[PDB]
Design a protein around this ligand. Structure first.
Ligand SMILES: [Cl-]
Ligand SMILES: [Cl-]
Ligand SMILES: [Zn+2]
Ligand SMILES: [Zn+2]
Lengths: 30, 21, 30, 21, 30, 30, 21, 21, 30, 21, 30, 21
């Protein structure tokens, strides 16, 4: 695949895509 | 974290899987 | 604020907006 | 849960706020 | 909730979310 | 341009694109 | 209206343009 | 306006309600 | 990665993400 | 095709990758 | 209509909108 | 190309049609 910058709501769109049913955590404080 | 790995820097879809449950 | 009908990626969108820098966990059923 | 609830019927921003870290 | 930067189509997504059925105006000329 | 089937936030998206800097009003029925 | 029309059947960009300020 | 309040500067969801009809 | 149910603009989103800088072609049936 | 397949049933990222240039 | 900056996934959203059924190509290497 | 015409520079919806099939 590829490597790009993924920021903000675009980051969480991508996580939704990749994780889907597995679910995910978005934790910007790290 | 994810913001540094993926937004500030550059990341792959495989890396993004690091943050699935 | 008003009630929401949110499905697929649109939920993850709303969660991003609502939580901001605290981030969130997206956990669907099976 | 919230995922299914927001999709199948309705959902509020306040209920969504329960899912922030 | 939180305070973030909301620009462009992300601004109008947020307005849709908050206003919903009430409807809204997006007027960048102010 | 082609005809559009637009629902929920996707309408507000299209309106953003079409109107640009003039902005727009989003006014749903009840 | 336009909101319901674009969703229920179809809609054109030209009709949408009527909603700009 | 909204762009200055919300994009250039920072705004809350309650502020965004200022622009509902 | 998980299986995807993608419709309308959400497909074009996924394609953008998957292809990145190589880009892609979006070709629906009739 | 892929457009209809991803919408009507399901689709994989690997199948989507066939559509990159 | 209008003229704005269209970048990344926002570019391909716009192409989807304009082209629709015709389909399109997104080729950032040009 | 499209990125230069539309992202780096500025483009219209009519220009965007240049890239339809
Ligand atoms: Cl949908
Ligand atoms: Cl952006
Ligand atoms: Zn964006
Ligand atoms: Zn959608």
């Amino acid at each position: 695949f590829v490597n790009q910058h993924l920021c903000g709501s675009h980051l969480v769109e991508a996580l939704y895509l990749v994780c889907g049913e597995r679910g995910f955590f978005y934790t910007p404080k790290t | 974290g994810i913001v540094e790995q993926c937004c500030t820097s550059i990341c792959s879809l495989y890396q993004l899987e690091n943050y699935c449950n």
